[PDB]
From Swiss-Prot, chains A, B:
Job of this protein: TJP1, TJP2, and TJP3 are closely related scaffolding proteins that link tight junction (TJ) transmembrane proteins such as claudins, junctional adhesion molecules, and occludin to the actin cytoskeleton. Forms a multistranded TJP1/ZO1 condensate which elongates to form a tight junction belt, the belt is anchored at the apical cell membrane via interaction with PATJ. The tight junction acts to limit movement of substances through the paracellular space and as a boundary between the compositionally distinct apical and basolateral plasma membrane domains of epithelial and endothelial cells.
UniProt subcellular location: Cell membrane; Cell junction, Tight junction; Cell junction; Cell junction, Gap junction
UniProt family annotation: Belongs to the MAGUK family.
Post-translational events: Phosphorylated at tyrosine redidues in response to epidermal growth factor (EGF). This response is dependent on an intact actin microfilament system. Dephosphorylated by PTPRJ.
Coiled-coil segments: none
Expression across tissues: The alpha-containing isoform is found in most epithelial cell junctions. The short isoform is found both in endothelial cells and the highly specialized epithelial junctions of renal glomeruli and Sertoli cells of the seminiferous tubules.
Summary of subunit composition and partner proteins: Homodimer. Forms heterodimers TJP3. Forms a heterodimer (via PDZ2 domain) with TJP2/ZO2 (via PDZ2 domain). Interacts with OCLN, CALM, claudins, CGN/cingulin, CXADR, GJA12, GJD3 and UBN1. Interacts (via ZU5 domain) with CDC42BPB and MYZAP. Interacts (via PDZ domain) with GJA1. Interacts (via PDZ domains) with ANKRD2. Interacts with POPDC1 (via the C-terminus cytoplasmic tail). Interacts with HSPA4 and KIRREL1. Interacts with DLL1. Interacts with USP53 (via the C-terminal region). Interacts (via ABR region) with F-actin.
This protein's name: Tight junction protein 1
Whole-protein residues included: 421 to 502 of 1748
Domain notes: The 244-aa domain between residues 633 and 876 is the primary occludin (OCLN)-binding site and is required for stable association with the tight junction. The C-terminal region (residues 1151-1372) is an actin-binding region (ABR) that interacts directly with F-actin and plays an important role in the localization of TJP1 at junctions. The ABR is also required for the localization to puncta at the free edge of cells before initiation of cell-cell contact. The ABR is also necessary for TJP1 recruitment to podosomes.
Domain PDZ: 1-82
Name of the encoding gene: TJP1
């Protein structure tokens, strides 16, 4: 049900995000060959926490900038849960 | 603002979908090297119409099954608009 994903940030975090009208922040894509991919992050997962931030109470714009601004080399810890729905490949 | 994407369906349509609580059906991924990719479908686009179906008034489950069930070789026409938000790669 929950998953803890930990990787060292490279030049980018290797993720894209999606959400709606304050209904949670979701993984909308994981970069191929990235540390995030290697460690098991998946499209459709809800992000609950990144490092010391509650990702269930953050506005969209901050969620984006927080991840962009983490320095290269720093460890990123994501707690994810496996409002939005996502289909499989069709 | 709008885009019309037309391709011949292969073994799969080459797309994944996302939505919320009846807030529209969105492109959540486009398969690399697919006809859909070649013709310009992009993650974050809202699907307005597929063939002769109003994709703004269809429940999630039908949206999925409709696309799965289209036969191989049939032309797929998607009208897309460039409730959900999607970030860029971070």
């Amino acid at each position: 049900s929950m998953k803890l994903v930990k990787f060292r940030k490279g030049d980018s975090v290797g993720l894209r995000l999606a959400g709606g009208n304050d209904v949670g922040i979701f993984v909308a894509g994981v970069l191929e060959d990235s540390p995030a991919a290697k460690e098991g992050l998946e499209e459709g997962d809800q992000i609950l926490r990144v490092n010391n931030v509650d990702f269930t109470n953050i506005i969209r714009e901050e969620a984006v900038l927080f991840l962009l601004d983490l320095p290269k080399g720093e460890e990123v810890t994501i707690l994810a849960q496996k409002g939005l729905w996502f289909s499989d490949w069709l």
